[PDB]
């Protein structure tokens, strides 16, 4: 410690701990003496530096602070910061950390404030040489790590940081902002940013992500594209690069409103396309939703090879993943152009082969039938629906369908829903259509109408590739001047195709769904089908839907129910977008009826999703308003008002649901509590609002894919025996369906308890009966994610009919909708050129440890399992590939995605 | 109201229904009950001086992660758990544990095998957690479990 003159190196380390005589007197006196001594100081600069390096290992603040205290003065006292500019500019190298020792390594608010400014200025000027960039570099990649630089070096980077952020907020902007007095433009600091970026990229990741977003421009991300794509293999592995790219997008979502967010995802797509994994390219291009990029990744495998090679099998798989099927239609027609075998390739791109593997899985699963049956009442109507509710997904129950007796013993609308549940027995299958034709060509038109709903459900398995399309059959029934037939026909068309876009389907629904001049309450089905068809792409928010909403208000305002169904359809049509939804929000609001305000608040949910942190408070101020106005005054109408109250509650939960999927993967945790307290607000406020909200609770859980499926629906159930409107129970089971007889062993009993136990009318009893069978399928036949799976961040297209039914009071008519249960996830099985219908092995991981990514990524440890497992849901979602050890290489990665597997054997 | 009220705070009652009148101007603390009844002071290092080497060894491992656990987190080190003081009795083994508690600003809780300190549980096989928990309430603390290892 104490001085021990310069007689050995050990004592020079101690000499500068008390007071250097090599930097304090000498340099100071020299500089304020002759101006030809700059040739002496340049050598004595080197002497100064060594002492920093040696004392850039000593923890204590005092013997770095005090030793260099009078040097901090010399910056302005003797060196003057600039005189003969290069020499005094180059003598800031040792003095710059001196400024930091009082800025950072001591707190005196007066000296910290003033020297923030000074550090920023002298850093800006001294990075023109790039020797300030070199000064940062030796602390970035330290000499021998110690406390000091672990706090000081953050301050260097923060000067540039703050500045770029300040350029958006202020109206003074870079050197006219005096919080830094440095410019972010030029070729003096802009070259300092780039030079810093290369250095901090090599070993770490520090200011690199942070520069991009503070500019706000996709130009910034493209500057990094160049540097990284060289660094992709040699300076660090591909994998590390992939983690860099996705970490930028997923992290900054609440910092990227819709117009910013898409612009950032384009560059990400380009970095992948530069890199080897075309498997990464497809996932991100679907996220953008641009048809062009889908074709581009497909072309990347197709164009190079003049043969079928792994490349064409892989292209077909990449498009197969989307059960929306927007990809499927696109890739089928590229293949005809290229011309190889048609028979295997088009099917494989389409959802046909997914029919095939469901059969392989069914054979293992088995079939179970446990339905009740008693004649003559709502208890008979319930029983016949129940049999299909137990046979959801492709199951074998041929014989039960063949007995047409019970079909006829249902009456009125009951017949329609009876044939509709028959369709779900062969959901996603080429059969069914044979038994259905019987009803379609015989007795009352009601069974003919229910047949069309069942056609849609069965046609989910094949509609892309243009083999057995539902349109071909279903067009005639729309022409037919009967309302039951036409409304049922177009509802099945939307299920059948999916979010797939086809000209004949999409354009069929444009004439009608602008023909809302006709007063018809079952013409809602027109917009509901249209919404499901349209979503899957970055929406243009087509104008036929916008206009037909206005026309319907004009014709009728004494039928609030029809316009309530239709309102939901508008908001879901727009979902899959947030840019264009800002536009239509303002439009709806131009025309103002209190009936119109219902449409506005639902549409606000879609508009702001991507942050939805402004959205949630919006749907709470709205709650305040009715009561607010009444006090202010003091110091036919029926339908419009009833609509007003109901929409507001639906919207609030609706907002929560879109947000938690698009941004978070773990805030799903927080989202439950809002609903408990939110329903509690209403419980102790409007009784009318309570009716909607009970149902909404069940679908909040289902949409977000909450993690605890055991405790929550059941805990709610006991309360909901007392509360009116038993459709709450149906929505709870949508969530619990998860994997069957994992959650659902509790479910049947619990829903059976309130149904058998209580009697409060025979209208209520039906809904309770149905709920139990919906939940269970034999041996966990399938799982439902509302998410696309490919992206858990994606929102569904076929699962939106589950989402749809909570804003409306329960009726037999809504009971017809519920026979549909699509949203399905495929069971992943490894594939080959000859088509293997089983898996080999997989790894699954319940708990990650990574918080540098929202979900982390499964490390190479997982619990190993064998063949023949459906995709595992929450509490099992991270899924790793086990195929490496058998001398096979996966071509199609896995994370918990819906995607099928394919492998290549050496 | 109940938010002005809390566990282990003495109130005033108007005793014909026991209707709460005021909070009391007192509050009991149970950790002081044990510390007092044992009755041990705290110290500085000028009441231990002479084994000054030992003061360095204990300052390193105990005091520095109280004042700055930040350094240990960067280091990635699981902080010291059990620290043995041992030697001939009366060599200031005890007074050094006192001296640190004043400087670390911990409650010096001398445990000695006694149960007179307790009158509400009365054994240490049902007061290990509760002992730890009181030092949690009144944190930080220095739990001087003196095991002589000749008792009985």
């Amino acid at each position: 410690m104490v001085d021990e003159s310069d007689k050995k190196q050990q004592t020079i380390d101690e000499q500068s701990q008390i007071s250097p005589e090599k930097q304090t007197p000498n340099k100071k006196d020299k500089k304020k003496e002759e101006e030809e001594q700059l040739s002496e100081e340049d050598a004595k600069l080197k002497t100064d530096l060594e002492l920093l390096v040696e004392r850039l290992k000593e923890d204590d603040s005092s013997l770095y602070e005090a030793s260099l205290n009078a040097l901090k003065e010399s910056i302005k006292n003797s060196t003057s910061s600039m005189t003969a500019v290069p020499k005094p500019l180059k003598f800031l190298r040792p003095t710059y950390p001196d400024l930091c020792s009082i800025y950072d390594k001591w707190t005196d608010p007066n000296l910290k404030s003033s020297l923030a400014d000074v550090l920023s200025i002298l850093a800006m000027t001294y990075s023109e040489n790039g020797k300030h960039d070199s000064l940062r570099y030796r602390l970035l990649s330290d000499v021998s790590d110690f406390e000091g630089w672990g706090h000081e070096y953050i301050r260097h980077l923060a000067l540039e940081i703050g500045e770029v952020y300040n350029d958006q907020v202020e109206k003074d902007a870079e050197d006219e902002t005096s919080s830094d007095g440095s410019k972010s433009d030029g070729s003096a600091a802009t070259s300092g940013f780039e030079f810093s970026k290369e250095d901090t990229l090599r070993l770490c990741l520090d200011i690199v992500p942070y520069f991009l977003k503070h500019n706000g421009e996709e130009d910034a991300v493209d500057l990094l594209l160049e540097i990284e794509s060289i660094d992709k293999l040699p300076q660090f592995v591909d994998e590390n690069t992939f983690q860099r790219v996705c970490q930028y997008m997923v992290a900054c979502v609440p910092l990227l409103p819709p117009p910013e967010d898409v612009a950032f995802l384009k560059t990400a797509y380009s970095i992948y396309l530069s890199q080897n994994e075309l498997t990464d390219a497809i996932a991100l291009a679907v996220r953008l939703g641009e048809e062009d990029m889908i074709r581009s990744v497909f072309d990347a495998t197709s164009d190079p090879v003049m043969h079928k090679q792994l490349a064409y099998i892989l292209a077909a798989q990449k498009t197969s993943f989307e059960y929306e099927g927007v990809q499927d239609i696109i890739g089928n027609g590229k293949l005809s152009e290229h011309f190889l075998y048609l028979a295997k390739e088009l099917n494989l791109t389409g959802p046909k082969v997914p029919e095939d593997i469901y059969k392989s899985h069914l054979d293992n699963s088995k079939s179970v039938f446990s339905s009740a049956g008693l004649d003559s009442a709502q208890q008979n109507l319930a029983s016949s629906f129940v049999n299909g509710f137990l046979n959801l997904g492709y199951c074998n129950d041929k014989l039960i369908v063949d007995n047409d007796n019970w079909v006829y013993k249902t009456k009125g609308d009951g017949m329609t829903s009876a044939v509709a549940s028959i369709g779900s027995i062969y959901q996603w299958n080429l059969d069914g259509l044979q038994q259905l034709d019987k009803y379609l060509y015989v007795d009352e038109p009601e069974v003919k109408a229910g047949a069309l709903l069942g056609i849609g459900i069965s046609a989910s398995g094949v509609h892309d590739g243009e083999v057995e399309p539902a349109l071909l059959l279903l067009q005639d029934y729309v022409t037919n001047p009967d309302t039951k037939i036409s409304s049922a026909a177009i509802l099945g068309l939307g299920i059948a195709f999916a979010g797939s876009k086809n000209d004949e389907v999409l354009g069929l629904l444009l004439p009608i769904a602008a023909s809302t001049d006709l007063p018809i309450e079952t013409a809602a089905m027109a917009s509901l089908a249209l919404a499901h068809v349209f979503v899957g792409t970055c929406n243009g928010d087509i104008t036929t839907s916008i206009m037909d909403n206005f026309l319907e208000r004009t014709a009728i305002e004494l039928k609030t129910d029809w316009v309530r169904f239709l309102a939901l359809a508008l908001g879901i049509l727009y979902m899959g977008q947030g840019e264009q939804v800002d536009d239509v929000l303002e439009t709806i609001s131009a025309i103002e009826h209190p009936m119109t305000s219902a449409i506005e608040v639902l549409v606000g949910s879609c508009a702001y999703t991507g942050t939805g942190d402004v959205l949630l408070i919006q749907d709470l101020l709205h709650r305040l308003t009715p009561k607010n106005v009444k006090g202010e005054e003091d110091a036919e109408i029926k339908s419009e008002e009833k609509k007003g109250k109901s929409s507001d509650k639906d919207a609030t939960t609706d907002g929560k649901n879109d947000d938690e999927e698009e941004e978070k993967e773990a805030g799903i945790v927080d989202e439950l509590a809002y609903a408990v307290l939110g329903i509690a607000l209403i419980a102790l406020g409007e009784d009318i609002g309570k009716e909607m909200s009970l149902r909404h609770f069940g679908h909040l859980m289902h949409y977000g894919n909450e993690h605890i499926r055991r405790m929550v629906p059941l805990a709610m159930g006991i309360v909901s025996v007392s509360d009116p409107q038993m459709k709450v129970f149906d929505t709870l089971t949508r969530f619990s369906h998860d994997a069957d007889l994992e959650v659902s062993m509790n479910s049947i009993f619990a829903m059976g308890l309130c149904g058998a136990g209580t009697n409060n009318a025979r209208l209520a009893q039906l809904l309770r009966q149905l709920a139990s069978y919906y939940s269970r399928e034999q041996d966990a036949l399938f799982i439902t994610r509302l998410a696309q799976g490919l992206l858990h961040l994606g929102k569904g297209t076929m699962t939106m009919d589950v989402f749809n039914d909570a804003h409306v009071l329960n009726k037999v008519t809504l009971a017809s909708i519920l026979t549909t249960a699509v949203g399905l996830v495929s069971p992943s099985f490894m594939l080959k050129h000859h088509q293997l219908f089983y898996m080999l092995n997989a790894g699954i991981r319940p708990k990650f440890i990574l918080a540098l990514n929202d979900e982390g990524e499964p490390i190479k440890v997982n619990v190993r399992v064998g063949q023949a497992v459906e995709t595992v849901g929450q509490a099992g979602r991270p899924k790793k590939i086990t195929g490496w050890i058998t001398q096979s290489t996966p071509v199609l990665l896995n994370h918990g995605e819906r995607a099928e597997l394919e492998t290549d054997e050496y | 109201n109940v938010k002005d009220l809390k566990a282990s705070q003495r109130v005033c009652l108007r005793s014909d229904s026991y209707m709460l009148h005021k909070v009391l101007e007192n509050k009991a603390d149970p950790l002081v009950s044990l510390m007092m009844v044992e009755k041990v002071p705290d110290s500085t290092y000028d009441m231990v001086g002479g084994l000054t080497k030992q003061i360095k060894e204990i300052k390193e491992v105990i005091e520095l992660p109280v004042k700055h656990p930040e350094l240990f987190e960067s280091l990635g080190i699981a902080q010291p758990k059990g620290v043995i003081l041992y030697g001939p009795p009366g060599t200031g083994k005890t007074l050094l544990a006192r001296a640190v508690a004043h400087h670390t600003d911990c409650k010096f809780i001398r445990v000695s095998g006694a149960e007179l300190v307790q009158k509400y549980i009365g054994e240490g096989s049902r007061m290990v957690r509760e002992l730890f928990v009181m030092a949690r309430e009144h944190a930080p603390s220095i739990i001087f479990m003196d095991e002589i290892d000749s008792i009985g």
């Binding site: - | 044992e38 009755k39 006694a114 007179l116």
Partner: protein, 142 residues
Amino acid sequence: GSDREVQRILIELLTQMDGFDQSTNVKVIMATNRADTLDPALLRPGRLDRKIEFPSLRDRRERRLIFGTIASKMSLAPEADLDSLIIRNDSLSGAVIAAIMQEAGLRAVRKNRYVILQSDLEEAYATQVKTDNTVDKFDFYK
């Protein structure tokens, strides 16, 4: 419930002892038969500093005095001697020396005599003698 009554009294003692300090009083005198009824805090200095032992062993000059004080009170005969009591046992308590002399004053009345004879005085020693094999005239460890 019964033990928590015992303890609540002892706590008050300890606490009143703290208050008692730096006063011109003598802090409490107390005795105990044994040394295994103490609590660690009761024995601790600041409540109890001093530990005045009483040994039974005492030395040759002190057994003399203690026989000698109990002979000051009572009558003896010139035949009786207190110097024949040193040679016998060398670990007695002060109560047993007050005991033998009282026991010899009953044997004296069986003779019907008011002066203690040395016949009386040795017989009384022989009863309640509490013999040792560590004391003089009983040894081969020499």
